[PDB]
Amino acid sequence: GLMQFTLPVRLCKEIELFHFDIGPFENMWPGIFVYMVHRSCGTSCFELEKLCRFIMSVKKNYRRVPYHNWKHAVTVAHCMYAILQNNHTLFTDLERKGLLIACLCHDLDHRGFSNSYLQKFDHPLAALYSTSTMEQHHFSQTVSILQLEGHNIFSTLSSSEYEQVLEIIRKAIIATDLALYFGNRKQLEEMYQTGSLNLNNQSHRDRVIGLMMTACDLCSVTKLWPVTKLTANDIYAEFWAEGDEMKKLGIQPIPMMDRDKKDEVPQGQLGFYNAVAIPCYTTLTQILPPTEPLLKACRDNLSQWEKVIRGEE
Ligand SMILES: Cn1cc(-c2ccncc2)c(C(=O)Nc2cc(-c3ccccn3)nn2C)n1
Numbered sequence: 001g002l003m004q005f006t007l008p009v010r011l012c013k014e015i016e017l018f019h020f021d022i023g024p025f026e027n028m029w030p031g032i033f034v035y036m037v038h039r040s041c042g043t044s045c046f047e048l049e050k051l052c053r054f055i056m057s058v059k060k061n062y063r064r065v066p067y068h069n070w071k072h073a074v075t076v077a078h079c080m081y082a083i084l085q086n087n088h089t090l091f092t093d094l095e096r097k098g099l100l101i102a103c104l105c106h107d108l109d110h111r112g113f114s115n116s117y118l119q120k121f122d123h124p125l126a127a128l129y130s131t132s133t134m135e136q137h138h139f140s141q142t143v144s145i146l147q148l149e150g151h152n153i154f155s156t157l158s159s160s161e162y163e164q165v166l167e168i169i170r171k172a173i174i175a176t177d178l179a180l181y182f183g184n185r186k187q188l189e190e191m192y193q194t195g196s197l198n199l200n201n202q203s204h205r206d207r208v209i210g211l212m213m214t215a216c217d218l219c220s221v222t223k224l225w226p227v228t229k230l231t232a233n234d235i236y237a238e239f240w241a242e243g244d245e246m247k248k249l250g251i252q253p254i255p256m257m258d259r260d261k262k263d264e265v266p267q268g269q270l271g272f273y274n275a276v277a278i279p280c281y282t283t284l285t286q287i288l289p290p291t292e293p294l295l296k297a298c299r300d301n302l303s304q305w306e307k308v309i310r311g312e313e
């Protein structure tokens, strides 16, 4: 019980910042996650033996794809850590537990293809789960891993606390389906502006946790420019593989996914920042003021893509 994880000095300080990059040393990522659980949640939240076994089974069930990989999982959990740590008193003990675990598991067994490609391919998962197809799959993989002998990190919760955390994780993982973000953010916007927003209303907390999940999921746009720009290569490597597979089904893909239209990337990033990322971090910052550094970093990155278009890089 007296066994802490400690990080080297630079990581001990930088892990607390929203723009932290977890680095290229994969074998330190589990340790980084346990560190974040210990500080976010407590040294008693989980049996270390079970938590380590859970982490390693999760890692094994992420695939070797350019972006939707184990690094993404840990990165998304770090952004949740930073939100939780800057909003100490707003979240219950169950929510802190559930949300880091949800972030770690939110893309389990991703193949690097969108919901839309699965439906056009007529993948068996598109028959089992008609909407949020990959996200319902990620939640299914999460429940499966939790039921492996030795992996039930929630075993010391009471029966009703166990049902609550699995429900926090289900809604948090479904919320990472970007198709659902637009409605959720619009509704949070109206509620914040007419002043009906009420963090004691469960259906409102669910909406706010959804937005936190979108914010954490998109957090590549909130890093320092060199991280954001090199992450974009990984994201587009999957988009363009998907476009290739569309062309194999005899469907011209959208330009976002066509490797023949790489020149259009900078203008496509502008649309994405303006339509998704800025609106996401603006509402998050209106609901949770200490998450403003995410909105500031995002706007810095929009300005860098505007400089790419003006030829200044
Ligand atoms: C889910 N997600 C994460 C990112 C993202 C985040 C960070 N870096 C790169 C991409 C994106 C995205 O780019 N989205 C995105 C890119 C383009 C586009 C259109 C034409 C030509 C090139 N790109 N359209 N959209 C909607 N979507």
Ligand SMILES: [Mg+2]
Binding pocket: 106, 107, 134, 176, 177
């Ligand atoms: Mg996902």
Ligand SMILES: [Zn+2]
Binding pocket: 072, 076, 106, 107, 176, 217
């Ligand atoms: Zn994700």
